[PDB]
Each structure stands twice: as C-alpha cells, then as structure tokens.
Design a protein around this nucleic acid. Sequence first.
RNA 1: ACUGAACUCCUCACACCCAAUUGGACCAAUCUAUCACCCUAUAGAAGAACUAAUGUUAGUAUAAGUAACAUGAAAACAUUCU
Lengths: 91, 140, 45, 166, 148, 275, 59
Amino acid sequence: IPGRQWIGKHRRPRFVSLRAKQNMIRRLEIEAENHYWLSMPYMTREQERGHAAVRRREAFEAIKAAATSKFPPHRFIADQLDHLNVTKKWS
Amino acid sequence: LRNRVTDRYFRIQEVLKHARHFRGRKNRCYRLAVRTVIRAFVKCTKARYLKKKNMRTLWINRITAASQEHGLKYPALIGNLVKCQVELNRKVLADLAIYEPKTFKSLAALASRRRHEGFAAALGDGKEPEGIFSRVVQYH
Amino acid sequence: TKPIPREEGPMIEQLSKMFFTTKHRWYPHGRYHRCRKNLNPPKDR
Amino acid sequence: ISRKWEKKNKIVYPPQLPGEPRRPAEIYHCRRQIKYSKDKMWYLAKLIRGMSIDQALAQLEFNDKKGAKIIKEVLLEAQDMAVRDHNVEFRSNLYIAESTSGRGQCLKRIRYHGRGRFGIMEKVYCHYFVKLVEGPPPPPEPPKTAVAHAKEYIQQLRSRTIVHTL
Amino acid sequence: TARGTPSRFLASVLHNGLGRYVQQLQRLSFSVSRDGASSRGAREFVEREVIDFARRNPGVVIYVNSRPCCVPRVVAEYLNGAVREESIHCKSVEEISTLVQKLADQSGLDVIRIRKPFHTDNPSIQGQWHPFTNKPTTFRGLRPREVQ
Amino acid sequence: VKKGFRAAFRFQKELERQRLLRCPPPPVRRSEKPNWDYHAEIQAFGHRLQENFSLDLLKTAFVNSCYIKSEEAKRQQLKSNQELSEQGTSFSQTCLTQFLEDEYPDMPTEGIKNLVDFLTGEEVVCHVARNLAVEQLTLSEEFPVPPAVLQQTFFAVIGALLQSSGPERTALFIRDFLITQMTGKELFEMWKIINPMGLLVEELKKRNVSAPESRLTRQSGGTTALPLYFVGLYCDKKLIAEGPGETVLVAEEEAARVALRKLYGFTENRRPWNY
Amino acid sequence: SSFSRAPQQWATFARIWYLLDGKMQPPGKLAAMASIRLQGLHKPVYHALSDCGDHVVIM
RNA sequence: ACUGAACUCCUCACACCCAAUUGGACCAAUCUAUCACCCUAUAGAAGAACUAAUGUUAGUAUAAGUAACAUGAAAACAUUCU
Ligand SMILES: [Mg+2]
Ligand SMILES: [Mg+2]
Ligand SMILES: [Mg+2]
Ligand SMILES: [Mg+2]
Ligand SMILES: [Mg+2]
Ligand SMILES: [Mg+2]
Ligand SMILES: [Mg+2]
Ligand SMILES: [Mg+2]
Ligand SMILES: [Mg+2]
Ligand SMILES: [Mg+2]
Ligand SMILES: [Mg+2]
Ligand SMILES: [Mg+2]
Ligand SMILES: [Mg+2]
Ligand SMILES: [Mg+2]
C-alpha cells in the first residue's frame, strides 16, 4: 500500500463482515428501544418543578457542612507518653 | 568518603538470585541481569492472563475433541447444556471428557436430546406441548 | 474378537525410521542441557 | 595468590576397617609460573585427562609443543613423589584423573605501534595442575547404541502424564 | 518467578485429614531478649498470650529461651522434620499472635509453588479415556482392508 | 576498608551458610540439640495424637535394648522394649486382619497376609513413625535410627496405647495411621505376585467356573515398535477382564491382574474406606 | 479401569493408525481431517507438549 | 450459535499501572547521644544509595592465540663455505 496502511490519501480498504453488520444492527435495536422509553415522561416539566428542592438543599448542606468542618485532629497525652514504652524492660 | 556504602553486595545478590538459570552473562553480570530479571518479572505478571486464557482454550480443545467423538460439535454441546440448566463449566467438562467418559457420553446424549427438542420445538411453531428436558426450573 | 496369535548417521536414520520421528531428537545435547534437567522431578498420583 | 592445590596432598584419612574396599591413592602436583599461556596448556592438559601415565609420557615425548616437555617434567616428578611420599607401589599403576591449567601472575610490557599510539603486551604465565589416581584408567564411555536410544525414547513415552487436568 | 523457583504437588503429611487430624507443628522456640526494644512485643507476647496459646493446642511444646539476643526469632519445627525460622523483630503483640497462629495452622511442606490446586489419587472412577473407548468393535475383530 | 559492622556481620553469616551448604554436617539427633525437654515432648506426643497414655509406660515404650546395652557400657566408664512391641505387633496384625477380612471378604487369606505384611512392613511403618515424631523420641544406640528398631518402637507405642486405653482406641489408631497408607495404592503394588494367569485359573476353579480363553479384542500398531493390544479374558463367551499391553503377553498377564482385582473386590472403583 | 499404572498410561497415549480413502475427495477437506488426527486434536488427552498425535494413511 | 479483554459478574483481598511537575508514607548503610550486646531501638546528623555522563582509576575479557615479529649453511662448534 502507498504508506502507513490506515491513515492518508491511499488507505488500504477494510470491509464490513456479517459480524460487524449484526453488531451494528443489535446496537441500533437497543437504541430504538431507548427511543421508545424516552417518549413517555411520568410528569410534565411544570409538574416536576421543585419536587426535590428540599432534598437537594439538604444534600448541599451536607457537602457544605463537610467542607466547613475540616481542622487539625486532637492531640492526646497518652500517645506522647505511650512512646516511652520503647524502652520497656523486664526484671 | 564519610559514609560510603557497605551493604552493596547484598543488593547485587538481591537481583542476581533470580538470574541463576539464565544463559550468557545474564546469570553473572549485574548490568545485564537487572534488565533480564526486570523483564522476566514483567513476563511473569503478564502471563497470568495468558495462563487463564490458554487453560480455557485448551479446555475448549478437549471438549471439542471428545464431543466430536460422540458426533456433536462444541457449540451444540455447550449451548444445549446451558439450555438444560446444567451449568457445568469448561474445566469440569474437560475433566469428565478425560476421566469419566460415560458421564460425558450421557451429557452428550442430554445435550443432543435437548438440541433435537429445540429443532422439533422451533419446527412445529405455535402452541404445542413442550419438551420433557426442555422444561425450565423457575426459582423465586 | 480375534484369537491370540501363536555409525551415528545410519543409527539415527534407523531410529527415525523405527519410531517415525525426525532425526533431530536423537542427536545429543551438551552439558548445559544435561545439567539443567531436574533429575528428581515431583511424582504425583 | 591462592595455593590450595599443594595442600591437597596433606589430607590424612582415618585408618580403614576390615570390611571396606581399598582406597585408591590420589596425588596432587602442580607447577607454578610456567612461561606459556593458559590456553595453549589447555590442549596438552586436555590430551592426557584420562590416559595412564605411561601412555601420557609416550604422548608428550613426541609432541612438538613447548608445554609438552614441561608437563612431562610434572608427570615424572609426580610419579617420583607418587612412589616415595604417597605409598603407590607400582609406577605404572597411575592414571591422570585431573590435568588442568589456570593462569599465573602475568606481566605487562609496552608494544610499540606505528605512530605515537601503542599497546600493552602481557608476558603470559600459567600454572599446571595434576591429580594422579592409583589404579587402572577408567574405560572410555561407550557411545550409546540404538538399544539405549530406543529405551530412552520409550522411557520418555512411558513417563508422560495427562497434563492440565486431574 | 516460577521457572527459577522449584515446584511441588499439593499433598499432606500422612494423609492428614482421613482418619484424624494431627497438628503438624511440634515445637515453637522463642528467643526473647530481656532488655531490648527489638523483643518488646515478644516480651508482651510472653506475658500475655503465649500461655493461652500454649493451652489452646497442647500438642505443641514451646521453648521460650530468654537470652540476650539482638534480633528475636521464633523457630517452628514440624512433624516431618521441617524447620521454619521466622523473625519477630519489632512486631507488635497482635502481629505475633497472627504470625504464631499462622505457623500453627500450616504444615511442614515447602512454601514453593504448588502445581495443581487439587490432588486426587483416584482421579478416574468410570475408567480413564483410551482411544478405544468410544470406538465400536467390528465383527471378527477385522481392521480396514482386511478380507478374512 | 569501609567502616561499619553490619555488612561484615551479615556477610559473615552468609559465609557461614555457604560453609554449611558446601560441607553439610552429619545429622545429630534431636535430643543432642538445644530446646529439648524429653518429658514435655512425650506428653506432647500423647496430646498430639488425641489419646491418653500412662506416661511412664510410654517412657518404657520408647526405650530400646541397644540403648540399654550402650548405656550400661557408658556406665562402666530400665525395662526394655520387646514386650510392648510384642503386644503391639500381635494386636496390630490381628486388627489389620479384622479390618481387611471385614472390608474385603472376597480376598484370599494369602493376599490378606501379604497386605498386612505391607502395612506392617518396614517401609510403611518407618514412613509413618518418622512423621509422627516417634524417631525423635526413640532412645536408641545409633543415629539415624535403623528401620527394625523404629518399627519395634512403633509397635511399642501401639501396645502401650493398648495397655493405656484398651483395644478399641488402638483399633482406631491403626485405622487412622496404618490403614490410610494403602489409599491410592494398587493391590499388586502391595501384594506383589508372579504369574497372575495361573493364580487366576485357580481362583476360577474355586468358583467352579470353566477355564478362560485369552482373546484379542482390540489392537493397534501390530508391526511397529509401539504396539497396543487389549487382551480380553472370556469365560464361556463372557468376559471377566480386558487389559492393554505393549505386547500380547503383557496384555494377557495384565488382564489376568484386572480379573484378579475384580474377583477380590479390590477394584479401582470399590467403596472407599469408611472413617 | 482397574489397570496398573504403566498399562493404563500406555493405553491412554498409544497412537492409532487411521486409514482414509481419498477417491473423488477434495484435498483440503481431507487435509482438515488428516491434520486433526496428526496433531492429536481428536483426543481429549490432547496437549501440544504430550506428543499425542497419531498416524494417518491416505490412500 | 460459538469463540473472544485487564469491561462486568464470581471467592477472598484492596492505598498498590501515566511524562514534566507536585503531595505523602516509609527507609539501606555510616557517625553521634543513650539503650542494646550474634547486630539492635528512639532520636540527632550527613561526602547518606549508580543497569547509563565517547565518565575516571584499576582488573580481566572480545577481536585472538589473530595481525605482526625473528636465526645464511654444514661441522670438531677449532673451522670452512655461500
Ligand atoms: Mg505504508
Ligand atoms: Mg592482553
Ligand atoms: Mg472468557
Ligand atoms: Mg476493572
Ligand atoms: Mg480494588
Ligand atoms: Mg537511624
Ligand atoms: Mg554522594
Ligand atoms: Mg558499580
Ligand atoms: Mg539511569
Ligand atoms: Mg560509567
Ligand atoms: Mg586468547
Ligand atoms: Mg602461530
Ligand atoms: Mg580473524
Ligand atoms: Mg602472518
């Protein structure tokens, strides 16, 4: 072939087998059923308005509150004194 | 030199103990052994996928051969053992194909029986009584 | 049922013709391959 | 420098029992700093590695190489110390079990080339190692016949297992 | 890797499960320094846990040595003569309880690669395949292009 | 000269490990090495196998006679082993013939006697006792322990457990250690025989059945160096066995062996041992 | 079943001479069957390193 | 219909596949302080880690036992001859 098979002006040919046709067809059928089930909403756009504003508001209060509660951890005496047991002996 | 390295023999021996069976100077010289030991470890991890793959294609070769002994082919055998809710896998069916060939012959007769119930089932379309081995067990 | 009835070149052609295999597995292999062989392999079963 | 080969004639064994075969003697002799190279000594050392000492003396009296006379000096000296020091009764009853040759401490001289450039010659020295063993020489290994190859192939066929299953 | 390391087949010691189960671990040998931070969690293991461990399985005999060591060790010795020496150097008490319980649970087989994940010794019950299974005989045992 | 101690110490130990793996030391017995308490280890031997002994009697069970002789010869500058071993080999032979005569009723008594000569032989018993920590606890003269001594101590432990907890717990002990050594083993790898065809003819005469025809069923490669034959053995036109072979004689004798397995219930497909 | 070790092993791996008439037959469709019976791919004991092929005579 | 992935499911375990860059957890050996005492611990320090600079120095390979090199002849080693 003139150069680098798959890019360029003179590319080598590639042909569509029966595998690739049946694959593309069953993808189109799954797609067309997605086109069926998106054609019938349970609400209009007026009816859905504000139906989850409370839960979205409380969810962002949870994210906002998790953001504004970030601070260094507590420092204890028992950890620092607990280091002293590295020279614990027997007798 | 204030502190220069003393423990260096053991790092060389960490790498070189994996090279003890190589050819050439790869078993001896550290510069060559690092490349071939790294490379042997990369092949060692990428060959786990190939171990699983090659075992499975080896099982499909064994199930294919022993099902050609009973007149069936591989896709009729596997598809029609699936359609009986006998969900044995490829490893077990290859091991029955080798060690217990009466059981594999009875699985071949069960799969070909179900295949002919599928042929006579799709042949006489419309409402007809179902096959006996064509019944499914409903779980709930 | 049936009843029971009652030189290196030439030697490697004779063994190859005898066991129906090619000539190459009859020529020997050197010390490096004789001494990588696991001489006490694991038995099973 | 290591000189471990002179020590090997010093290993004393405990005295044997009545119920034990007679041990063959072993005689370790070597010469150091032979002015000859270590791989021209390999051919003469390799030549005599299983022959008896009378056969090896016969093969080294008539070889044109320089090392043959020196190896014949080593073998005559090890035959004499074989008889005197090591309790080997028959002079003829000795075969060369080991005849190797390492490298010696070499020197470095300057070889002048065709311009200001040059090279580094080495004045090459070598050693020569010998273990003689009391006894007849071992027989040469017979080449394996079609019976041995047939039994080896069939033994491999009997060896094999159904693999990657139970 | 697996080609540089030896391998073995999956076995047991003396058919370790068939009749009865026998604990395969004979001796543990702790060597624990009295004064030394290396064997601190070993000492806290001897003060706390080696007695309850020694009672939970009485087929194991335990030798705490308490010498001035600089790295503490535990030496598990198994019924088949295998001796696995592992270090408890600077390990906490819980990690020595899991380590000693790990040595107790296993056996004196090598920790080299195991080839097959299973070991039948009677693999075939209906008779193994040979090429004359699944081949029908013919009359008088005749072979092809044989007349009589 | 690099200053330090730790690489010199570790390399000193790896020189020690190469000095070991170059010149391996002779095997010293376990009692002559540290971390040994012989009484605590007899008690651990008792609790390890899950039974109870009378511990002084197990102490007499591990003490040989050659150790007593060499110990007296070292006194110049204890009860022996024979009794408990005698009781243990008498009882172990009787329990192995009870278990084998019950679980294989079709066997001849010659074959059962040779199976008990396998299960109480030195290869099996010496294989069992080296993995039950018996060899470490035997007080003997030479090391490593000779096989007849270690067999004598093994049946000393069996007779000791007879006097400890009666016949039935020893019957379970022999059930769980001596019988499990025949699992996966052929009959004629245990009861080794010569000329199975004549023995098969006598076994057919004891069932009052006419003499069998050896009869070539299937073959392959008859003129090559790798033949294969399946000789069957018919008995009034009904086969008892059929076996393969590289020649015809090998397949005939091996079909005689398959027929002997099927007459005795010692097939490959027999009901396994019940535990 | 109930063989010994070596006769069972010899029986499993012994190779079988096949005959195969090729009158009025295409050579590639004979070559498929001859190829399968030469590699041992008609055996469930097949492995590429067990040397379990057979002999095929095409007349 | 089957085959077919590191995708997904399955049993157990999960921090454990990017350049330049950046954040973090550990850490070999050495010395110092103090423990320790068949080779360690907590810190403090620093000439603190090399499969790569036509790197430097030393060793030994390869090319290779290769290219190249060298003694006129006989004899009594007095001599003679070319
Ligand atoms: Mg191109
Ligand atoms: Mg040079
Ligand atoms: Mg898959
Ligand atoms: Mg994934
Ligand atoms: Mg994860
Ligand atoms: Mg530090
Ligand atoms: Mg630096
Ligand atoms: Mg370096
Ligand atoms: Mg680099
Ligand atoms: Mg460099
Ligand atoms: Mg050279
Ligand atoms: Mg030359
Ligand atoms: Mg050249
Ligand atoms: Mg020249």
